[PDB]
PDB file of C-alpha atoms in Angstrom:
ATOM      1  CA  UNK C   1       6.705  15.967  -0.999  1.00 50.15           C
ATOM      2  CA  UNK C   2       9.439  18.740  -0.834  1.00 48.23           C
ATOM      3  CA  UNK C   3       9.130  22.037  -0.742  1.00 43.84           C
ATOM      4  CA  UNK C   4       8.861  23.924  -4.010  1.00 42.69           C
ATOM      5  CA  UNK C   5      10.147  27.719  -4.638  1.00 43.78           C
ATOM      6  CA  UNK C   6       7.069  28.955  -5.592  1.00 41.89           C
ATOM      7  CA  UNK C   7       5.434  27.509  -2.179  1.00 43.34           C
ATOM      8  CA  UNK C   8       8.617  29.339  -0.042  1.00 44.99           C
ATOM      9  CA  UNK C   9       7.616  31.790  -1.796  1.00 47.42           C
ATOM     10  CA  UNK C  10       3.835  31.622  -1.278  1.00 50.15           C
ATOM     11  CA  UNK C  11       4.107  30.387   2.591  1.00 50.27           C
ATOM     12  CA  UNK C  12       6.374  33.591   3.338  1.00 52.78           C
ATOM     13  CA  UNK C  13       4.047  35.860   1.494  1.00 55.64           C
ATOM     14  CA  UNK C  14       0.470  34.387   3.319  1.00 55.79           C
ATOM     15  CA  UNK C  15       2.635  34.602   6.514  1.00 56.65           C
ATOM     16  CA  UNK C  16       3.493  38.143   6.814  1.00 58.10           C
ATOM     17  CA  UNK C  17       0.034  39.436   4.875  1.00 60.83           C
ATOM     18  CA  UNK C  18      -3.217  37.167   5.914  1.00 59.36           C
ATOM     19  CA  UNK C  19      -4.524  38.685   9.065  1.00 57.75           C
ATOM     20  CA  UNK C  20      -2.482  37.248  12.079  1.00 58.52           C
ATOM     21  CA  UNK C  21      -3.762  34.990  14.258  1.00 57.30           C
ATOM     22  CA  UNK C  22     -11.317  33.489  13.311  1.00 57.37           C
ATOM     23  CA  UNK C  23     -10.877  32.477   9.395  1.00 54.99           C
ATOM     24  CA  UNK C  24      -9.456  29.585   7.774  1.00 56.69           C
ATOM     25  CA  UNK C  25      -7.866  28.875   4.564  1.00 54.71           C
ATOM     26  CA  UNK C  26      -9.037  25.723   2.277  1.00 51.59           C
ATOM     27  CA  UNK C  27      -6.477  23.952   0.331  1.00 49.23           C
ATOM     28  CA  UNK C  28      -6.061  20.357  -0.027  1.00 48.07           C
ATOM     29  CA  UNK C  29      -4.761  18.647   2.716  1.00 43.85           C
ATOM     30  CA  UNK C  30      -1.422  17.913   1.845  1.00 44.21           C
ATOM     31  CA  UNK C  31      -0.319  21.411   1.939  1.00 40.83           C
ATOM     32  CA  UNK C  32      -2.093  21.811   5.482  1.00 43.33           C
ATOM     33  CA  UNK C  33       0.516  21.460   7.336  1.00 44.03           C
ATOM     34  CA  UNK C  34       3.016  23.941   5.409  1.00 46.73           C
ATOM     35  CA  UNK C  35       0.281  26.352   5.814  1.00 47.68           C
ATOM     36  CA  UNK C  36      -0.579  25.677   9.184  1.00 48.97           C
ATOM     37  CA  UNK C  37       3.366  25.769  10.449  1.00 49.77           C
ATOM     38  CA  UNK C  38       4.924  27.688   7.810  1.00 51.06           C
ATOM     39  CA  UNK C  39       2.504  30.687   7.112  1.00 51.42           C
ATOM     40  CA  UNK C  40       0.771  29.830  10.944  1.00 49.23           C
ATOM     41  CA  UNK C  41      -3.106  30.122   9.535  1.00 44.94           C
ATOM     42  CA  UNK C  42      -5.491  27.622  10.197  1.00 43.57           C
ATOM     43  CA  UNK C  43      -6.302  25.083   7.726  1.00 45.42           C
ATOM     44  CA  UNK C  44      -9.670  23.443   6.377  1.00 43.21           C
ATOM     45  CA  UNK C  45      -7.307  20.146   6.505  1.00 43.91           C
ATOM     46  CA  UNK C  46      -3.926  18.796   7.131  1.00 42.17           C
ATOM     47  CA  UNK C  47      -4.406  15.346   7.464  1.00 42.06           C
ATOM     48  CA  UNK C  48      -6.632  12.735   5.073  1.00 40.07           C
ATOM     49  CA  UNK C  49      -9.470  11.843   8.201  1.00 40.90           C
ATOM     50  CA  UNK C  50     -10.413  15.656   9.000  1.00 38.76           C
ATOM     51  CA  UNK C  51     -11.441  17.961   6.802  1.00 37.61           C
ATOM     52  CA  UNK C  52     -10.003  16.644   3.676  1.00 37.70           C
ATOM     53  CA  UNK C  53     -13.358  15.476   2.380  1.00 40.48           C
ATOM     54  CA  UNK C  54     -14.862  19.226   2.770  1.00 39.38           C
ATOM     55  CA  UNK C  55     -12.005  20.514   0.460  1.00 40.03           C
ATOM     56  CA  UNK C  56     -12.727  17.905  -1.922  1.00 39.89           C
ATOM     57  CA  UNK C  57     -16.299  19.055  -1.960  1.00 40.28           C
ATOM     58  CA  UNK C  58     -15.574  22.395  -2.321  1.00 39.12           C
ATOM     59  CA  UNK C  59     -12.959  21.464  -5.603  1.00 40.53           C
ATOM     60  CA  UNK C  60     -15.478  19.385  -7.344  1.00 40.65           C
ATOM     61  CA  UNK C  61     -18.145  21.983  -7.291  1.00 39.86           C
ATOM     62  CA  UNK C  62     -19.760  22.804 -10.257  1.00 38.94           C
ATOM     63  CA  UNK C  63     -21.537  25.733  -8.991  1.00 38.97           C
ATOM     64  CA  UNK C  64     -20.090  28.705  -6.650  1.00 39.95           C
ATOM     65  CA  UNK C  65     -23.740  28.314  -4.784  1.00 36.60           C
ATOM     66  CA  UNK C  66     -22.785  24.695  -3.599  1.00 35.28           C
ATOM     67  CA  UNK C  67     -19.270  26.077  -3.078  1.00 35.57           C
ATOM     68  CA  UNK C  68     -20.139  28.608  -0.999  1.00 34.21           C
ATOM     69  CA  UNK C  69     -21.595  26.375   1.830  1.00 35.28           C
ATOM     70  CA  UNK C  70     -18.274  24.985   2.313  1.00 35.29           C
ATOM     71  CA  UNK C  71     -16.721  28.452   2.309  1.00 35.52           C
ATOM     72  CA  UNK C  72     -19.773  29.265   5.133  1.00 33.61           C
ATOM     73  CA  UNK C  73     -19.476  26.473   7.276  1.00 35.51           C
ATOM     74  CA  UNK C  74     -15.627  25.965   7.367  1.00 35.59           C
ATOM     75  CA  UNK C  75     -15.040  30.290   7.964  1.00 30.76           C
ATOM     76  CA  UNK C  76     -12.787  30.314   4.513  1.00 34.75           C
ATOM     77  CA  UNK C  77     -11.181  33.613   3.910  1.00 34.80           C
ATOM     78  CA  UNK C  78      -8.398  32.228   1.451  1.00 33.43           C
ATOM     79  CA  UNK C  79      -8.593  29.473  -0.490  1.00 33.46           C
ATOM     80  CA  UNK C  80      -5.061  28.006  -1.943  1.00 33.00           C
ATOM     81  CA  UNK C  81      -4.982  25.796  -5.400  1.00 36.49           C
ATOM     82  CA  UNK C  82      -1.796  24.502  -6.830  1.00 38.45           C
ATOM     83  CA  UNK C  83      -0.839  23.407 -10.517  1.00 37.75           C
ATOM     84  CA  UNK C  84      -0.322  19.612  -9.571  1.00 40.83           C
ATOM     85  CA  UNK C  85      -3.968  19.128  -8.796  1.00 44.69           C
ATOM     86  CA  UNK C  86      -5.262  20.515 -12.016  1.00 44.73           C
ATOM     87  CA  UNK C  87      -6.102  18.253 -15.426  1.00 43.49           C
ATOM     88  CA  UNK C  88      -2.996  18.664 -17.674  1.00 43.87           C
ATOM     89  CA  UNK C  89      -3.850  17.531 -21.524  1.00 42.59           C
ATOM     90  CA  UNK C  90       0.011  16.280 -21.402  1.00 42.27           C
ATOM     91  CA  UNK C  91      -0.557  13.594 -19.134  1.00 44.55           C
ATOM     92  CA  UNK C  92      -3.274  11.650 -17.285  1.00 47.12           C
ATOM     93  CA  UNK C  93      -1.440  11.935 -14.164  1.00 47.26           C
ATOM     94  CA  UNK C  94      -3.003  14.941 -11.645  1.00 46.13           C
ATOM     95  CA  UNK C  95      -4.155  14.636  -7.848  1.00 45.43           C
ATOM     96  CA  UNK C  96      -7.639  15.567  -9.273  1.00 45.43           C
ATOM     97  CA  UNK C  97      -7.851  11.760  -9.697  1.00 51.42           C
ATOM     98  CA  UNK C  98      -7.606  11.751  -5.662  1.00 50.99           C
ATOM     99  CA  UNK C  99      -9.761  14.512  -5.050  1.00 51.77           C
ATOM    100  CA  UNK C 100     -12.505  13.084  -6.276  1.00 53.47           C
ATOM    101  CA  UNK C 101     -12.540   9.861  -5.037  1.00 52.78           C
ATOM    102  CA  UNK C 102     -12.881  11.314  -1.768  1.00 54.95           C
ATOM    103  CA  UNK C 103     -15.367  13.390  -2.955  1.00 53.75           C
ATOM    104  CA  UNK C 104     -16.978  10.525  -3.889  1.00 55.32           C
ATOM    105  CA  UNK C 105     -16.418   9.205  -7.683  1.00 58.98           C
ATOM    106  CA  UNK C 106     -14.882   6.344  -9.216  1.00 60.47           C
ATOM    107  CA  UNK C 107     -12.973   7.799 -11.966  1.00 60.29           C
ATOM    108  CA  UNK C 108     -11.520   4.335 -13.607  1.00 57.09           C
ATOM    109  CA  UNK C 109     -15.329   3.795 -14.562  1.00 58.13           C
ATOM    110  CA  UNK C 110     -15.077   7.528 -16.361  1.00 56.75           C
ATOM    111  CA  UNK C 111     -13.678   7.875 -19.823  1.00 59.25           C
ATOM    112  CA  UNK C 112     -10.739  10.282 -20.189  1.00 58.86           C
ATOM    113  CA  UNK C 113     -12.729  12.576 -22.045  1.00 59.00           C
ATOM    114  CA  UNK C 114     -15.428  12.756 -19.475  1.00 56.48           C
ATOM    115  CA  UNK C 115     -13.415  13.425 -16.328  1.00 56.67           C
ATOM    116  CA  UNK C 116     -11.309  16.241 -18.147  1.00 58.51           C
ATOM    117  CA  UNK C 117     -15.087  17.277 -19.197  1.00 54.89           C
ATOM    118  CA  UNK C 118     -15.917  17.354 -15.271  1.00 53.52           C
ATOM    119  CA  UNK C 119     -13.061  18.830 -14.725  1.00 54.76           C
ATOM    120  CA  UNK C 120     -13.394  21.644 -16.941  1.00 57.61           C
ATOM    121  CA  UNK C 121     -16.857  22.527 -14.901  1.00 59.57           C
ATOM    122  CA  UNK C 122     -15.286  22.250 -11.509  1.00 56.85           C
ATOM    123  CA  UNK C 123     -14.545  25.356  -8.965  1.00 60.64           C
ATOM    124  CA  UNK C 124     -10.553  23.947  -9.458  1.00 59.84           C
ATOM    125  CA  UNK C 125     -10.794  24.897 -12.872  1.00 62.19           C
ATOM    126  CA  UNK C 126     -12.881  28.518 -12.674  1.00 63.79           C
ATOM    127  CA  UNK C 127      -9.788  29.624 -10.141  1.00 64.58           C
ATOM    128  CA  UNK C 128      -6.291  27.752 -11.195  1.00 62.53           C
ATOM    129  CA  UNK C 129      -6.697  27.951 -14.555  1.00 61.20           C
ATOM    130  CA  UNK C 130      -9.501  30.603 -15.129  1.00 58.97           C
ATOM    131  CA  UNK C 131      -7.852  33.095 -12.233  1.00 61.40           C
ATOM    132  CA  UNK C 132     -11.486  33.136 -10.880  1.00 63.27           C
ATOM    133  CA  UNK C 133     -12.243  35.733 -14.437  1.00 59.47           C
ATOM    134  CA  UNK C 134     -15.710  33.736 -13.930  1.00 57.25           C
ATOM    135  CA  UNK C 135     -16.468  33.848 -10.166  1.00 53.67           C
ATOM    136  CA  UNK C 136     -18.806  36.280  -8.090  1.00 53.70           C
ATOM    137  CA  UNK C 137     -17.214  34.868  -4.711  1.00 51.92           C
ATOM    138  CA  UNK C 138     -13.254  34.310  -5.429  1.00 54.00           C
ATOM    139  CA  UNK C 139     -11.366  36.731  -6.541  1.00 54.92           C
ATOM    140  CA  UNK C 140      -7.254  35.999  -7.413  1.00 55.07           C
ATOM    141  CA  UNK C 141      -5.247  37.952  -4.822  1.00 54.43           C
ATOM    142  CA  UNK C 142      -1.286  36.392  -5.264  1.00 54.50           C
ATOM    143  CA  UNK C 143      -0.135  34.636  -8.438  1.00 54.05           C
ATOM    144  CA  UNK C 144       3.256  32.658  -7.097  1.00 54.66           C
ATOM    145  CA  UNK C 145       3.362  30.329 -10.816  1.00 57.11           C
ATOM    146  CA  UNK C 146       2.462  27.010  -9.805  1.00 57.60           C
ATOM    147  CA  UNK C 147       0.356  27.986  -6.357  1.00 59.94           C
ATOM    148  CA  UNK C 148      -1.969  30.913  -6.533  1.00 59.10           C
ATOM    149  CA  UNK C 149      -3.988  32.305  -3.453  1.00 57.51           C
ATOM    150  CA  UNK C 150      -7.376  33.527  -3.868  1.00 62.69           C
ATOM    151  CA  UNK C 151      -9.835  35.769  -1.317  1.00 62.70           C
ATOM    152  CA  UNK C 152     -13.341  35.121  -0.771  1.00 61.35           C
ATOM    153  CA  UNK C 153     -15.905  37.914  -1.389  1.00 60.73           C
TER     154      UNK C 153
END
């Protein structure tokens, strides 16, 4: 996975105006470690063992209530979504297909319609594609295109 403009561009930006280290920011975990080196804030998960499944959780939520214990018992401050994990009606390819078999479905018994229906109800979808318009808790705080960084309230 290389490193995109946008995320330079997010990473330096989180970096030099996140409080400096208390908090952590959730994201899936394959960005963990750009965020945990890069921008040097501490991560919900960086790795697939720790953590991961907690993020997942959080992404599949269909309510901010349910999302909000996550948010409680990890300390998120920030919470990080990118355009690759979203549901694009181009293409059936998305690492929402990942995310929620960790969280704990078995999409290939789902028709297409019904997980871009789930989708469309999940906490991924009321912040990257919504901008969190529809959330008490979230609130959009950077825009960088394909990654945007959100602040919990």
């Amino acid at each position: 996975m290389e490193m995109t403009m946008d995320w330079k561009e997010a990473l330096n930006w989180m970096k030099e105006n996140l409080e400096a280290q208390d908090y952590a920011v959730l994201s899936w975990w394959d960005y963990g470690n750009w965020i945990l080196y890069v921008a040097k804030k501490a991560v919900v998960c960086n790795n697939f063992q720790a953590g991961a499944d907690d993020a997942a959780k959080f992404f599949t939520a269909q309510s901010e209530e349910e999302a909000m214990k996550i948010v409680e018992k990890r300390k998120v401050r920030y919470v990080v979504t990118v355009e690759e994990l979203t549901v694009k009606p181009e293409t059936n390819k998305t690492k929402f297909i990942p995310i929620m078999q960790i969280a704990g479905y078995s999409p290939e018994y789902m028709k297409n319609k019904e997980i871009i229906d789930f989708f469309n109800k999940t906490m991924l979808y009321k912040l990257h594609v919504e901008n969190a318009t529809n959330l008490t808790h979230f609130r959009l705080l950077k825009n960088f295109g394909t990654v945007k960084i959100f602040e919990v309230k």
